Ligand binder design. Structure first.
Ligand code: 3XW
Length: 467
């Protein structure tokens, strides 16, 4: 409204006061997304963007929040005339959704850095006329809620956002941009992207948020970063507390990435009496398997990263092998470059550095080393197999000779007597990719044939003429 009952907890004088507001809103029929995002962006601004004068917590006075809320609802009510877009069946039309998107878009500053921190919230929209990509989508959903459009909800993949709406919430609409230098599809469905089996649209196994999940999204969206070196402890604590509130109420059940975020926060600063980070990573993975056909990559990446940071080479390799087993059933499309970058960095930087250190530790006498464990060699092979299988049938290739040098290096880190123990079945491993099937004999020789491996991985037809 704001309604009277929404105003009773103000002023918000602490982290716990903000948590009480979120609890009260989540207890309501429909939590107020506009209120909540304004409060979060207010406190984030005064804890991360400008801490001048800070002594404990930036007190959120009702008069301040209510004025920002009024600026938002005035802008949306004034610019979106509902009578022009009659609600057939108590659901919204594509034209209405496009109009709200246009209103948000046309309010933004003409030029700014879209990758900046702290431009995700409606506080940034109102005070700075700046939003990031998914912030635009969220703002469209908040605007629609303020207009009474109960059917418009946020849709999320692992690298993009859009809305669902209409009869049975079955319609999709693009409302924001994706990436940089991609061409805009605003107003269109996402069915072409689903049909092409791109990562970007997750084969249709994307998140369809309810209002409580939209709250979880804003909380995940909090950015504690003050600069490259420094995080706001106050914001970390707020995000963590709010994520646990949501978890207790059941609202992270269908939100794999939120469970990983929560796990990462617990690793940094554990809450007594709560599940360990590992338990939480596994719940993230279980959420993906349960609700999303185990078609998400980041639940395994979150797990692998944990094991990496804890120098648990075996378990990190297993999780990355799992990431690849997901990706293998996708086609690598135009606009999937973020997941390509993640796979590239794991294969060509993270794994090599992990195994370099394992090699040094083996020279020094380590026992139980991943490098002497044939199941760890198998995980390494499964990782490459999934990547090669991904590439099959894709409209753009994945592998090139830059990947081959690191594969030869990585294979070389395992002695032949270890590599020879893996049984490749047409420690036991089955390859799905034709590339790795062709590589099988090369993988067990005491001396890795580097040139033959390169030829097999990149399917380069020929060697050099002269020489
Ligand atoms: C944990 C992690 C990240 C962290 N990243 C994980 C994905 C998170 N994304 C999200 N988290 C909650 N909600 C949403 S909704 C959404 C779509 C849209 F942005 F709205 F469009 C995205 C997203 C944001 C943080 C990034 C790369 C990572 C890992 C873990 C690994 C591993 N292993 N990697 C890969 C890597 C390691 N080195 N270099 C890359």
């Amino acid at each position: 409204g704001l309604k009277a009952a929404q105003k009773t907890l103000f002023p918000l004088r602490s982290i716990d006061d903000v948590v009480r507001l979120f609890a009260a809103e989540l207890g309501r029929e429909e939590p107020d997304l506009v209120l909540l995002s304004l409060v979060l962006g207010f406190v984030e601004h005064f804890l991360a963007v400008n801490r001048v004068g800070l002594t404990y917590f930036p007190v959120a006075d009702l008069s301040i929040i209510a004025a920002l809320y009024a600026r938002f609802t005035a802008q949306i009510r004034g610019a979106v005339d509902l009578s022009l877009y009659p609600r057939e069946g108590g659901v919204s039309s594509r034209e209405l959704v496009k109009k709200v998107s246009d209103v948000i878009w046309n309010s933004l500053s003409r030029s700014y850095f879209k990758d900046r921190a702290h431009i995700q919230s409606l506080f940034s929209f109102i005070t700075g006329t700046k939003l990031d990509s998914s912030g635009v989508a969220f703002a469209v959903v908040g605007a629609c809620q303020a207009l009474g459009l109960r059917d418009v909800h946020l849709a999320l993949s692992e690298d993009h956002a859009w809305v669902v709406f209409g009869p049975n919430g079955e319609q999709t609409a693009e409302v924001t941009w994706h990436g940089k230098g991609n061409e805009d599809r605003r107003g269109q469905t996402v069915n072409a992207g689903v049909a092409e089996r791109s990562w970007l649209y997750l084969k249709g196994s994307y998140m369809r948020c309810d209002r409580k999940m939209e709250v979880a999204f804003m909380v995940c969206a909090i950015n504690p970063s003050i600069d490259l070196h420094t995080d706001s402890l106050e914001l970390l604590q707020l995000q963590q507390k709010l994520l646990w509130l949501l978890y207790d109420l059941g609202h992270l059940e269908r939100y794999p990435m939120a469970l990983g975020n929560l796990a990462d926060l617990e690793e940094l600063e554990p809450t007594p009496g709560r599940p360990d980070p590992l338990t939480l990573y596994h719940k993230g993975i279980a959420s993906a398997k349960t609700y999303y056909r185990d078609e998400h990559i980041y639940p395994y990446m979150y797990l692998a990263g944990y094991h990496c940071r804890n120098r648990n080479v075996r378990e990190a390799l297993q999780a990355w092998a799992d990431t690849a087993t997901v990706i293998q059933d996708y086609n690598y499309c135009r606009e999937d470059e973020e997941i390509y970058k993640e796979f590239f960095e794991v294969a060509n930087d993270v794994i090599p550095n992990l195994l370099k250190e394992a090699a040094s530790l083996l020279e020094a006498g380590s026992q139980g080393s991943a490098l002497q464990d044939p199941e760890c060699f198998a995980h390494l092979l499964r990782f490459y197999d999934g990547i090669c299988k991904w590439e099959e049938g894709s409209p753009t290739p994945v592998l090139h000779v830059g990947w081959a040098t690191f594969l030869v290096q990585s294979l070389g880190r395992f002695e032949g007597q270890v590599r020879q123990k893996v049984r490749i079945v047409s420690p036991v491993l089955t390859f799905q990719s034709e590339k790795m099937k062709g590589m099988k004999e090369l993988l067990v020789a005491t001396k890795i044939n580097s040139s033959a491996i390169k030829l097999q991985l990149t399917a380069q037809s020929q060697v050099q003429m002269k020489k």
